[PDB]
């Protein structure tokens, strides 16, 4: 039917608008935002700590630095690099060379349907072992907080301070899993799926949000430093969005024709 | 005393889509209010209804800029009894790939309802002409002729004061839902074709550009619905 | 009573030995609504298609064995003109629509004599592929004429010979032993049917409603109902009695709904 | 609601199971209006 | 008593119709359709994935193809072959020769009592390990959908995308089982026990339904590709029909007298 | 706080017939309506009541077509004081193998109630004659003589205008239920015999075919019931 | 006003310069009764034939002289497919009936420009043999 | 009902435990009628 798309508004019609027919009855409400994002998906795979760690230093990190890489998981669907917020998402097509291969993550599913600018929800976290008969624990600190390093000595054994604290620590049974829900805890009101600002007035990276996350989790072995092993253990981190809400329509990623 | 229980065979199972909550680990948290924020979206259909541009390979004559896909169709001056452009009513077809309807729909297994094609004439205002838009349900052979298109669902669009024309592709199917992706070609995943014919050639006065362009948009009709969330295709990151 | 005349459009079929009309599943298989799967206004019954179409089947002889049969696909027979079954305006409309939903009223005619003996089972069978050869191709009019009647065999009783997709050289060809489209000849009376017994009548009537895995179906490929004529008791008579009695049938589409109008169907 | 089929019971209080905004004290609407 | 079977209708009588006696009181309602099919039975036995797979290609498949066979289970009582819908049911009397032995399945019990044309119900799925102390997970995608292939790299480990997604993934405990119910999800209204149509207008196989199923399930090990094993593991898939309904009387399989 | 529980010995057990549900994994799914579909079946007894054909080995004189089993009995002209045909009232007997009653019944352990045998005369209309159908409960020796059959439950059927005759086999048993399959022969799984005798030979006029045939059907009587679902016999696929 | 869209079945024709529809003889040329000369129940309109069929005519050039013309017989044009006028189910029904009674709604399309000049007379003429 | 002996409670809502048709808005009957 006659219209003018230049207006910026085009009404959705049906078979009977210009032709002869009727409306098809509604088949489902699966496009409902709350229902759609309310399901677990893989966020990242991290190594399990077997001693107190040294949190990765800020960028740019110079050669010779002593730190633990691939252990901390930033809870966010946004791109991350080496446990920190990121803008560009990267991977390694040529894993051959010199230098540490930074861990990167991205909620692929989230962005394939994130046709909006802002998002908010509580976060259900599930940690699954990728190792046989593993006994591990999970640690977590809020957005804006940090990992408490070092350790204390009990009976000449070094026990990392990450065994204690005021934040959630979940000890799984041998071969078991860990699961719990966290509240939106960032100081921001909503999470910017895409962002155009800057978190600092000087030497800031445009588009890089400072606290677009639900905090950080890590996994460790309920054993003292001394009883350390040599074989690196891995654990998978799953997240689920509870009571999700979204604002300001936006685009979905470009699909190549090649 | 203790309540006798009988844990089931699936005890300790982790189901990624379980319709229930889990234990809170850090409760009693109040969050900054979000009343100040306008534009809240309740259902993705609200976005699928917004028409967005389709994409066509520029007629075998690309621009020195790789990946030459265009959101319009230039109307050639030479007469030819076949469609100016045509595409299948198969949601996984590349012409819908980057439209919101197509992008969103590709993340569900089924759809039900009408798809809407919107055309906008972008030639000069002094131009005149008529087009015949048609939709043909599946047939053994795809229609090409004006005489064939004219026997299917169609509407004649006249160029004039108003620049656009919306065309609703009726939902004509044997099943109440249709496949969103044509993994296997069948009457449940491919529903015929939409085609555009120039009815009467475009007429222009002297000193007017030739080959006016027609912009193509696609969106969900008002009775359009999507069912069954499926795994996404992560390739957009490669 | 036994004398009836059924009118439809400019058509009327009479019988003087009616057994009554066997209605399948519901008291009035004619009641039907538009398909919920199409938003376009359907084309419904008009007088030129509200009638009986009549065709022929191969004659019944003393040589036809027990359980041998003949099948008439619906609306398939209209599309191929099996038995000279030209559907006039019905076929013309069918060829121009993607979808079609309808029921059927059928009468099979075969007169014998008070001196002949034998019985034919006439049934309306849902979802069969009895009109197809094991290689997947539909039997041509010539092939139907060459065989006359299809003999019941292990293949049919088993479904072992139904159409299928060849796996390809990548796979070891398996031993096909069974198929869901089999025919257990002893249970064909489970379907809507009547028996044409030489001693009781010269015709049978069956009335069935639309059925399908979906609200409506593809015009060109559906075969929800198949008219089946199968020998239960071999034909017999003494020298002098009329030989090879003929068999004809009349079909009437009921409460049709056509959706998805387009140019005539053209094979790809 | 969301992807939740639990109609019956809620063991943990709303303020623990979920976060709630602090106070400062069907029908799908359009995201654009032509005026 | 006097009757005419040619009519197509014969009334069920009792002892007192022609003789002297009474009706026997009803002993049970076990022939009730809903009650009868509401029980688990073996559907298929599949191999467990230990890396991202390559779903079997469509027929006819030519020699030299690279794919994973015997891993995907089509949820249907209908005959299946190599994870795809089938018409004829086959087996291998001579397992000796060249070529892949296609996996085939059939709900033997269902067809022995499927004296009807159409059927519909929800489906309760139970997966049982046929291996000692196995830790596995189950994946599933809806009718009309497909397996998401490939993988992503985390800490130089390849993690198949089948570890994530928006569809059900059930991780069993070590030595445990998996169980859940799925809704009728095909685009068709009912499942054709026998079918006489065609799903395409060209080069179609008569009698072969396109979506007569409840989707497809597969099993995999919650381990990265690198920690792959050599011994193939198997898992048994059980199904149960919930709220079953049936339409249009039909035949039961022919029983040989030989 | 936590509720004290005492999981039982059978915890984690998977029971294939447990009368209960399990957790939903992909809920909130609406399905296409099935109101349009007629012919719904609620109970398989609805099908067991539909008479279907029985099967007999064609009298030691088969046709060149292997597996010569027929749904009728030809009435021989020669007099003989023994049954034209007879079979046991044992549901697992081959004569019921391919009837719906028998096929369905073989999938349950017990039955209670009457079985119905329906006969249809398929000879010429000019034919006349009478038959004696009888049912004998178990005896040490199976009756053969007309004099013996006549002392059991029986009815005399006259050939004429109406073509058929229904014969209800009374349910005469020591137990309230009977075995559906005669795994072991006993008074609980074998209930005697049904037999057909020609009372007065068939009379025909000149120029009429000889040996008219009688079609045999079996079905569940109105008070017929089946109990205890059992495992199926999958051999139909071999 | 000048912008109209006429729907019929699965058909719709638009124009943005309508002059209105010229109705001949009566306000609603659509009202009509069955023929009194046939006792058989007639076949009347069904949705597959309640629509617009579109065809072509030869182009207009500077060389065409005053009073030169083109004619389209009705229902003749359907029978011969003049201008590619295939009547789908309408023709199929027409070919299977001895008698047929009906009216017609027609629209002739020909766009020019504000810089062209010329005029065509478009009429519905009763009982001619111009074809 | 089916093979279900649970009279007591239903933890999950009907629309989650089962699928239900969307809207378009003892006594065993015969499957055949002679008319
Ligand atoms: Ca417990």
JSON list of N, CA, C and O in Angstrom, two decimals, chain F residues 173-207:
[
{"chain": "F", "resi": 173, "resn": "UNK", "atom": "N", "xyz": [-14.58, -69.37, 31.96]},
{"chain": "F", "resi": 173, "resn": "UNK", "atom": "CA", "xyz": [-13.28, -69.64, 32.54]},
{"chain": "F", "resi": 173, "resn": "UNK", "atom": "C", "xyz": [-13.30, -69.80, 34.05]},
{"chain": "F", "resi": 173, "resn": "UNK", "atom": "O", "xyz": [-14.19, -69.29, 34.72]},
{"chain": "F", "resi": 174, "resn": "UNK", "atom": "N", "xyz": [-12.32, -70.53, 34.59]},
{"chain": "F", "resi": 174, "resn": "UNK", "atom": "CA", "xyz": [-12.28, -70.71, 36.04]},
{"chain": "F", "resi": 174, "resn": "UNK", "atom": "C", "xyz": [-11.77, -69.42, 36.68]},
{"chain": "F", "resi": 174, "resn": "UNK", "atom": "O", "xyz": [-12.17, -69.06, 37.79]},
{"chain": "F", "resi": 175, "resn": "UNK", "atom": "N", "xyz": [-10.92, -68.71, 35.95]},
{"chain": "F", "resi": 175, "resn": "UNK", "atom": "CA", "xyz": [-10.34, -67.47, 36.44]},
{"chain": "F", "resi": 175, "resn": "UNK", "atom": "C", "xyz": [-10.97, -66.23, 35.81]},
{"chain": "F", "resi": 175, "resn": "UNK", "atom": "O", "xyz": [-11.47, -66.29, 34.68]},
{"chain": "F", "resi": 176, "resn": "UNK", "atom": "N", "xyz": [-10.96, -65.11, 36.53]},
{"chain": "F", "resi": 176, "resn": "UNK", "atom": "CA", "xyz": [-11.54, -63.88, 36.02]},
{"chain": "F", "resi": 176, "resn": "UNK", "atom": "C", "xyz": [-10.79, -63.32, 34.82]},
{"chain": "F", "resi": 176, "resn": "UNK", "atom": "O", "xyz": [-11.33, -62.51, 34.06]},
{"chain": "F", "resi": 177, "resn": "UNK", "atom": "N", "xyz": [-9.53, -63.72, 34.65]},
{"chain": "F", "resi": 177, "resn": "UNK", "atom": "CA", "xyz": [-8.74, -63.30, 33.49]},
{"chain": "F", "resi": 177, "resn": "UNK", "atom": "C", "xyz": [-8.12, -64.56, 32.92]},
{"chain": "F", "resi": 177, "resn": "UNK", "atom": "O", "xyz": [-7.97, -65.55, 33.62]},
{"chain": "F", "resi": 178, "resn": "UNK", "atom": "N", "xyz": [-7.76, -64.51, 31.64]},
{"chain": "F", "resi": 178, "resn": "UNK", "atom": "CA", "xyz": [-7.12, -65.65, 30.99]},
{"chain": "F", "resi": 178, "resn": "UNK", "atom": "C", "xyz": [-5.82, -65.18, 30.34]},
{"chain": "F", "resi": 178, "resn": "UNK", "atom": "O", "xyz": [-5.65, -63.99, 30.07]},
{"chain": "F", "resi": 179, "resn": "UNK", "atom": "N", "xyz": [-4.91, -66.12, 30.11]},
{"chain": "F", "resi": 179, "resn": "UNK", "atom": "CA", "xyz": [-3.64, -65.79, 29.49]},
{"chain": "F", "resi": 179, "resn": "UNK", "atom": "C", "xyz": [-3.88, -65.55, 28.01]},
{"chain": "F", "resi": 179, "resn": "UNK", "atom": "O", "xyz": [-4.64, -66.26, 27.35]},
{"chain": "F", "resi": 180, "resn": "UNK", "atom": "N", "xyz": [-3.21, -64.53, 27.50]},
{"chain": "F", "resi": 180, "resn": "UNK", "atom": "CA", "xyz": [-3.31, -64.15, 26.11]},
{"chain": "F", "resi": 180, "resn": "UNK", "atom": "C", "xyz": [-2.42, -65.05, 25.24]},
{"chain": "F", "resi": 180, "resn": "UNK", "atom": "O", "xyz": [-2.71, -65.32, 24.08]},
{"chain": "F", "resi": 181, "resn": "UNK", "atom": "N", "xyz": [-1.32, -65.52, 25.83]},
{"chain": "F", "resi": 181, "resn": "UNK", "atom": "CA", "xyz": [-0.38, -66.36, 25.12]},
{"chain": "F", "resi": 181, "resn": "UNK", "atom": "C", "xyz": [-0.27, -67.72, 25.80]},
{"chain": "F", "resi": 181, "resn": "UNK", "atom": "O", "xyz": [-0.07, -67.80, 27.02]},
{"chain": "F", "resi": 182, "resn": "UNK", "atom": "N", "xyz": [-0.41, -68.79, 25.02]},
{"chain": "F", "resi": 182, "resn": "UNK", "atom": "CA", "xyz": [-0.31, -70.14, 25.57]},
{"chain": "F", "resi": 182, "resn": "UNK", "atom": "C", "xyz": [1.15, -70.59, 25.60]},
{"chain": "F", "resi": 182, "resn": "UNK", "atom": "O", "xyz": [1.55, -71.47, 24.84]},
{"chain": "F", "resi": 183, "resn": "UNK", "atom": "N", "xyz": [1.94, -69.98, 26.48]},
{"chain": "F", "resi": 183, "resn": "UNK", "atom": "CA", "xyz": [3.34, -70.32, 26.64]},
{"chain": "F", "resi": 183, "resn": "UNK", "atom": "C", "xyz": [3.39, -71.77, 27.10]},
{"chain": "F", "resi": 183, "resn": "UNK", "atom": "O", "xyz": [4.17, -72.58, 26.62]},
{"chain": "F", "resi": 184, "resn": "UNK", "atom": "N", "xyz": [2.52, -72.08, 28.06]},
{"chain": "F", "resi": 184, "resn": "UNK", "atom": "CA", "xyz": [2.38, -73.42, 28.60]},
{"chain": "F", "resi": 184, "resn": "UNK", "atom": "C", "xyz": [0.91, -73.70, 28.40]},
{"chain": "F", "resi": 184, "resn": "UNK", "atom": "O", "xyz": [0.08, -72.82, 28.65]},
{"chain": "F", "resi": 185, "resn": "UNK", "atom": "N", "xyz": [0.57, -74.89, 27.93]},
{"chain": "F", "resi": 185, "resn": "UNK", "atom": "CA", "xyz": [-0.84, -75.21, 27.73]},
{"chain": "F", "resi": 185, "resn": "UNK", "atom": "C", "xyz": [-1.50, -75.52, 29.07]},
{"chain": "F", "resi": 185, "resn": "UNK", "atom": "O", "xyz": [-1.02, -76.35, 29.84]},
{"chain": "F", "resi": 186, "resn": "UNK", "atom": "N", "xyz": [-2.61, -74.82, 29.35]},
{"chain": "F", "resi": 186, "resn": "UNK", "atom": "CA", "xyz": [-3.35, -75.01, 30.59]},
{"chain": "F", "resi": 186, "resn": "UNK", "atom": "C", "xyz": [-4.78, -74.54, 30.42]},
{"chain": "F", "resi": 186, "resn": "UNK", "atom": "O", "xyz": [-5.13, -73.96, 29.39]},
{"chain": "F", "resi": 187, "resn": "UNK", "atom": "N", "xyz": [-5.61, -74.77, 31.43]},
{"chain": "F", "resi": 187, "resn": "UNK", "atom": "CA", "xyz": [-7.00, -74.34, 31.37]},
{"chain": "F", "resi": 187, "resn": "UNK", "atom": "C", "xyz": [-7.11, -72.81, 31.44]},
{"chain": "F", "resi": 187, "resn": "UNK", "atom": "O", "xyz": [-8.20, -72.27, 31.27]},
{"chain": "F", "resi": 188, "resn": "UNK", "atom": "N", "xyz": [-5.99, -72.13, 31.69]},
{"chain": "F", "resi": 188, "resn": "UNK", "atom": "CA", "xyz": [-6.00, -70.66, 31.77]},
{"chain": "F", "resi": 188, "resn": "UNK", "atom": "C", "xyz": [-5.54, -69.99, 30.48]},
{"chain": "F", "resi": 188, "resn": "UNK", "atom": "O", "xyz": [-5.69, -68.78, 30.34]},
{"chain": "F", "resi": 189, "resn": "UNK", "atom": "N", "xyz": [-4.98, -70.76, 29.56]},
{"chain": "F", "resi": 189, "resn": "UNK", "atom": "CA", "xyz": [-4.49, -70.18, 28.31]},
{"chain": "F", "resi": 189, "resn": "UNK", "atom": "C", "xyz": [-5.07, -70.82, 27.05]},
{"chain": "F", "resi": 189, "resn": "UNK", "atom": "O", "xyz": [-4.86, -70.32, 25.94]},
{"chain": "F", "resi": 190, "resn": "UNK", "atom": "N", "xyz": [-5.78, -71.93, 27.21]},
{"chain": "F", "resi": 190, "resn": "UNK", "atom": "CA", "xyz": [-6.41, -72.62, 26.08]},
{"chain": "F", "resi": 190, "resn": "UNK", "atom": "C", "xyz": [-7.84, -72.88, 26.54]},
{"chain": "F", "resi": 190, "resn": "UNK", "atom": "O", "xyz": [-8.06, -73.58, 27.52]},
{"chain": "F", "resi": 191, "resn": "UNK", "atom": "N", "xyz": [-8.82, -72.31, 25.83]},
{"chain": "F", "resi": 191, "resn": "UNK", "atom": "CA", "xyz": [-10.20, -72.47, 26.26]},
{"chain": "F", "resi": 191, "resn": "UNK", "atom": "C", "xyz": [-11.12, -73.26, 25.35]},
{"chain": "F", "resi": 191, "resn": "UNK", "atom": "O", "xyz": [-12.29, -72.90, 25.17]},
{"chain": "F", "resi": 192, "resn": "UNK", "atom": "N", "xyz": [-10.62, -74.35, 24.77]},
{"chain": "F", "resi": 192, "resn": "UNK", "atom": "CA", "xyz": [-11.48, -75.14, 23.92]},
{"chain": "F", "resi": 192, "resn": "UNK", "atom": "C", "xyz": [-11.36, -74.84, 22.44]},
{"chain": "F", "resi": 192, "resn": "UNK", "atom": "O", "xyz": [-10.34, -74.32, 21.98]},
{"chain": "F", "resi": 193, "resn": "UNK", "atom": "N", "xyz": [-12.41, -75.14, 21.68]},
{"chain": "F", "resi": 193, "resn": "UNK", "atom": "CA", "xyz": [-12.36, -74.96, 20.24]},
{"chain": "F", "resi": 193, "resn": "UNK", "atom": "C", "xyz": [-13.64, -74.45, 19.62]},
{"chain": "F", "resi": 193, "resn": "UNK", "atom": "O", "xyz": [-14.74, -74.67, 20.12]},
{"chain": "F", "resi": 194, "resn": "UNK", "atom": "N", "xyz": [-13.47, -73.77, 18.48]},
{"chain": "F", "resi": 194, "resn": "UNK", "atom": "CA", "xyz": [-14.60, -73.30, 17.71]},
{"chain": "F", "resi": 194, "resn": "UNK", "atom": "C", "xyz": [-14.55, -74.20, 16.47]},
{"chain": "F", "resi": 194, "resn": "UNK", "atom": "O", "xyz": [-13.47, -74.51, 15.97]},
{"chain": "F", "resi": 195, "resn": "UNK", "atom": "N", "xyz": [-15.70, -74.63, 15.98]},
{"chain": "F", "resi": 195, "resn": "UNK", "atom": "CA", "xyz": [-15.71, -75.45, 14.79]},
{"chain": "F", "resi": 195, "resn": "UNK", "atom": "C", "xyz": [-16.93, -75.13, 13.94]},
{"chain": "F", "resi": 195, "resn": "UNK", "atom": "O", "xyz": [-17.94, -74.63, 14.45]},
{"chain": "F", "resi": 196, "resn": "UNK", "atom": "N", "xyz": [-16.81, -75.39, 12.65]},
{"chain": "F", "resi": 196, "resn": "UNK", "atom": "CA", "xyz": [-17.88, -75.13, 11.71]},
{"chain": "F", "resi": 196, "resn": "UNK", "atom": "C", "xyz": [-18.21, -76.45, 11.00]},
{"chain": "F", "resi": 196, "resn": "UNK", "atom": "O", "xyz": [-17.33, -77.08, 10.43]},
{"chain": "F", "resi": 197, "resn": "UNK", "atom": "N", "xyz": [-19.47, -76.85, 11.07]},
{"chain": "F", "resi": 197, "resn": "UNK", "atom": "CA", "xyz": [-19.93, -78.08, 10.42]},
{"chain": "F", "resi": 197, "resn": "UNK", "atom": "C", "xyz": [-20.94, -77.68, 9.37]},
{"chain": "F", "resi": 197, "resn": "UNK", "atom": "O", "xyz": [-21.67, -76.70, 9.55]},
{"chain": "F", "resi": 198, "resn": "UNK", "atom": "N", "xyz": [-21.00, -78.40, 8.26]},
{"chain": "F", "resi": 198, "resn": "UNK", "atom": "CA", "xyz": [-22.05, -78.09, 7.30]},
{"chain": "F", "resi": 198, "resn": "UNK", "atom": "C", "xyz": [-23.18, -78.97, 7.81]},
{"chain": "F", "resi": 198, "resn": "UNK", "atom": "O", "xyz": [-23.01, -80.16, 8.01]},
{"chain": "F", "resi": 199, "resn": "UNK", "atom": "N", "xyz": [-24.33, -78.35, 8.09]},
{"chain": "F", "resi": 199, "resn": "UNK", "atom": "CA", "xyz": [-25.47, -79.09, 8.60]},
{"chain": "F", "resi": 199, "resn": "UNK", "atom": "C", "xyz": [-26.13, -79.82, 7.44]},
{"chain": "F", "resi": 199, "resn": "UNK", "atom": "O", "xyz": [-26.17, -81.05, 7.42]},
{"chain": "F", "resi": 200, "resn": "UNK", "atom": "N", "xyz": [-26.65, -79.07, 6.49]},
{"chain": "F", "resi": 200, "resn": "UNK", "atom": "CA", "xyz": [-27.27, -79.66, 5.31]},
{"chain": "F", "resi": 200, "resn": "UNK", "atom": "C", "xyz": [-26.42, -79.15, 4.15]},
{"chain": "F", "resi": 200, "resn": "UNK", "atom": "O", "xyz": [-26.18, -77.95, 4.03]},
{"chain": "F", "resi": 201, "resn": "UNK", "atom": "N", "xyz": [-25.96, -80.06, 3.29]},
{"chain": "F", "resi": 201, "resn": "UNK", "atom": "CA", "xyz": [-25.12, -79.68, 2.16]},
{"chain": "F", "resi": 201, "resn": "UNK", "atom": "C", "xyz": [-25.70, -78.50, 1.38]},
{"chain": "F", "resi": 201, "resn": "UNK", "atom": "O", "xyz": [-26.92, -78.28, 1.34]},
{"chain": "F", "resi": 202, "resn": "UNK", "atom": "N", "xyz": [-24.82, -77.73, 0.77]},
{"chain": "F", "resi": 202, "resn": "UNK", "atom": "CA", "xyz": [-25.24, -76.59, -0.02]},
{"chain": "F", "resi": 202, "resn": "UNK", "atom": "C", "xyz": [-25.95, -77.07, -1.28]},
{"chain": "F", "resi": 202, "resn": "UNK", "atom": "O", "xyz": [-25.51, -78.01, -1.94]},
{"chain": "F", "resi": 203, "resn": "UNK", "atom": "N", "xyz": [-27.08, -76.43, -1.60]},
{"chain": "F", "resi": 203, "resn": "UNK", "atom": "CA", "xyz": [-27.83, -76.80, -2.78]},
{"chain": "F", "resi": 203, "resn": "UNK", "atom": "C", "xyz": [-27.75, -75.65, -3.78]},
{"chain": "F", "resi": 203, "resn": "UNK", "atom": "O", "xyz": [-27.92, -74.48, -3.43]},
{"chain": "F", "resi": 204, "resn": "UNK", "atom": "N", "xyz": [-27.47, -76.01, -5.03]},
{"chain": "F", "resi": 204, "resn": "UNK", "atom": "CA", "xyz": [-27.32, -75.03, -6.10]},
{"chain": "F", "resi": 204, "resn": "UNK", "atom": "C", "xyz": [-28.13, -75.45, -7.31]},
{"chain": "F", "resi": 204, "resn": "UNK", "atom": "O", "xyz": [-28.40, -76.63, -7.51]},
{"chain": "F", "resi": 205, "resn": "UNK", "atom": "N", "xyz": [-28.53, -74.47, -8.13]},
{"chain": "F", "resi": 205, "resn": "UNK", "atom": "CA", "xyz": [-29.30, -74.79, -9.33]},
{"chain": "F", "resi": 205, "resn": "UNK", "atom": "C", "xyz": [-28.26, -75.14, -10.40]},
{"chain": "F", "resi": 205, "resn": "UNK", "atom": "O", "xyz": [-27.05, -75.06, -10.15]},
{"chain": "F", "resi": 206, "resn": "UNK", "atom": "N", "xyz": [-28.70, -75.57, -11.59]},
{"chain": "F", "resi": 206, "resn": "UNK", "atom": "CA", "xyz": [-27.72, -75.91, -12.63]},
{"chain": "F", "resi": 206, "resn": "UNK", "atom": "C", "xyz": [-26.97, -74.66, -13.09]},
{"chain": "F", "resi": 206, "resn": "UNK", "atom": "O", "xyz": [-27.48, -73.54, -12.95]},
{"chain": "F", "resi": 207, "resn": "UNK", "atom": "N", "xyz": [-25.77, -74.84, -13.62]},
{"chain": "F", "resi": 207, "resn": "UNK", "atom": "CA", "xyz": [-24.99, -73.70, -14.11]},
{"chain": "F", "resi": 207, "resn": "UNK", "atom": "C", "xyz": [-24.65, -72.69, -13.01]},
{"chain": "F", "resi": 207, "resn": "UNK", "atom": "O", "xyz": [-24.83, -71.48, -13.18]}
]
